[PDB]
Amino acid sequence: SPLELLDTVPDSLLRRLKQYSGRLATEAVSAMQERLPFFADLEASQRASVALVVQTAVVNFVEWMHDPHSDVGYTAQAFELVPQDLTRRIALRQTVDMVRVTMEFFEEVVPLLARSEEQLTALTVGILKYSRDLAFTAATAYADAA
Amino acid sequence: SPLELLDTVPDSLLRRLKQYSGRLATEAVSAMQERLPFFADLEASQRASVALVVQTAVVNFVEWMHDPHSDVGYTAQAFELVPQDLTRRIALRQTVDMVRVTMEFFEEVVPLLARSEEQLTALTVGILKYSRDLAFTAATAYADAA
């Protein structure tokens, strides 16, 4: 089962992932700069903050992989946009575009840490499940706020 | 690569999937009735229309699996809510809840048609990728309308 696939992923790899989280987040933001026109227009301060959020997401993913409990995690950090709701009016579409590019980026990269096909498949399934599951929880959070 | 995994899925299985689409859509709606309290409160007409939409989604998934072109498909049917925008004011949250339950249901079921682990993994990856990719395109469509 695809669940049994997840179980096969060493803490080794997960530990490694959290270790490299900040690098990945920087690379993700670079990919955003390339793929999203408006992203290059953002302030360096804002770009940095986004990258922080990406980094936290990476860490949360890693925790989820350990216990997909989705309740043990209990780590829904929210300090994004604390300075300002839609800080500098970041546009709904743009934020979606950013989330997309982020998830696409991780779909491309995270499997590569795997050391074996089994682990590779595990990681591809894990990231895809998380990405979706996360986007769902985000969408519900936006519905709640509406 | 997870892409090579998709290539391994016979038209046999995909053809079968589209054939069973309406049954699946009915089963999905049953699962929605069970998991979503407000869904039981919907009119039989509306429930039926939802199931139609689910059915179309199934078919679109199958097409996507053949060519993940995402442009050849060119099949973004929209007659949902033609009678009424948010027909009978269906609530943003509720629609998200429905999409979630639908995708969860398909994540659970669609892999089972596979006849081999390779195909099973392919299907799990395929559905998870599609579900996410679809939810993204939906979210952008909602951002555009805002």
Instruction: Give the span between the Cα atoms of B123 and B120, in whole angstroms.
Output: 5
Instruction: Give the span between the Cα atoms of A96 and A137, in whole angstroms.
Output: 14
**What are the C-alpha distances in Å from B37 to residues A25, A63, B32, B42?**
39, 31, 8, 10
Instruction: Give the span between the Cα atoms of B54 and B22, in whole angstroms.
Output: 8
Interface mutation vs chain B, best among A132, A140, A142, most B CBs within 10 Å: A132
Instruction: Give the span between the Cα atoms of B145 and B83, in whole angstroms.
Output: 18
Residue A68, both tokens: 């997909």
- B2/A111 Cβ within 8 A: yes
Do the beta carbons of residue A76 and residue A28 sit within 8 Å? no
Q: How many CB atoms lie within 10 A of CB A7?
A: 10
Nearest CB neighbour to B125, from listed A128, A136, A143: A128
Contacts of A25 (CB under 8 A, 6+ apart): A51, A52, A54, A55, A57, A58
Q: What is the CA radius of gyration of chain B?
A: 16
Residue B86 backbone zone (phi > 0: left; psi -120 to 50: alpha; other: beta): left
Does A144 reach chain B within 8 Å, measured CB to CB?
A: yes
Q: What angle do CA A101, A104, A109 make, to 5 degrees?
A: 120
> Which domains occur in chain B, in start order?
2-145 (1.10.490)
Nearest CB neighbour to A146, from listed B5, B92, B139: B92
Do the beta carbons of residue B135 and residue B103 sit within 8 Å? yes
On chain A, the residues whose CB falls within 8 A of the CB of B144 are: 93
Does B124 reach chain A within 8 Å, measured CB to CB?
A: yes
Does A8 reach chain B within 8 Å, measured CB to CB?
A: no
Chain A window 84-123: which residues touch B at a Cβ cutoff of 8 Å?
A: 91-93, 96-97, 99-100, 103, 107, 111, 120-121
Contacts of A110 (CB under 8 A, 6+ apart): A17, A61, A123, A126, A127
Site of tokens 């309290």: B37
Residue B91, both tokens: 């609530």
Does B36 reach chain A within 8 Å, measured CB to CB?
A: no
Instruction: Give the span between the Cα atoms of A18 and A55, in whole angstroms.
Output: 9
On chain A, the residues whose CB falls within 8 A of the CB of B143 are: 91-93, 96
What's this structure's resolution in Å? 3.6
* CA proximity to A120, closest of A5, A4, A1, A3: A5
> Which ranges of chain B does DSSP label H, i.e. alpha helix?
2-7, 11-35, 44-66, 92-109, 117-145
Instruction: Give the span between the Cα atoms of A107 and A126, in whole angstroms.
Output: 9
Do the beta carbons of residue A107 and residue A128 sit within 8 Å? yes
Experimental technique? X-ray
Instruction: Give the span between the Cα atoms of A132 and A2, in whole angstroms.
Output: 15
Nearest CB neighbour to A132, from listed B91, B93, B131: B131
- B89 exposure class (CB count in 10 Å sphere: 0-12, 13-18, 19+): exposed
Residue B81, SS3 per DSSP:
coil
Do the beta carbons of residue B111 and residue B128 sit within 8 Å? no
Cα dihedral angle (B73, B75, B76, B77), rounded to 10 degrees? -160
Per DSSP, A10 falls in state -
- A128 exposure class (CB count in 10 Å sphere: 0-12, 13-18, 19+): buried
* CA proximity to A13, closest of A98, A114, A145, A134: A114
Instruction: Give the span between the Cα atoms of A50 and A47, in whole angstroms.
Output: 5
Do the beta carbons of residue A8 and residue A122 sit within 8 Å? yes
On chain A, the residues whose CB falls within 8 A of the CB of B109 are: none
How many H-runs (helices) and E-runs (strands) does chain A carry? Answer: 5, 0
Start-to-end CA distance of chain B, whole Å, equals 38
Instruction: Give the span between the Cα atoms of A120 and A111, in whole angstroms.
Output: 5
Site of tokens 């048609």: B113
Instruction: Give the span between the Cα atoms of B44 and A39, in whole angstroms.
Output: 46
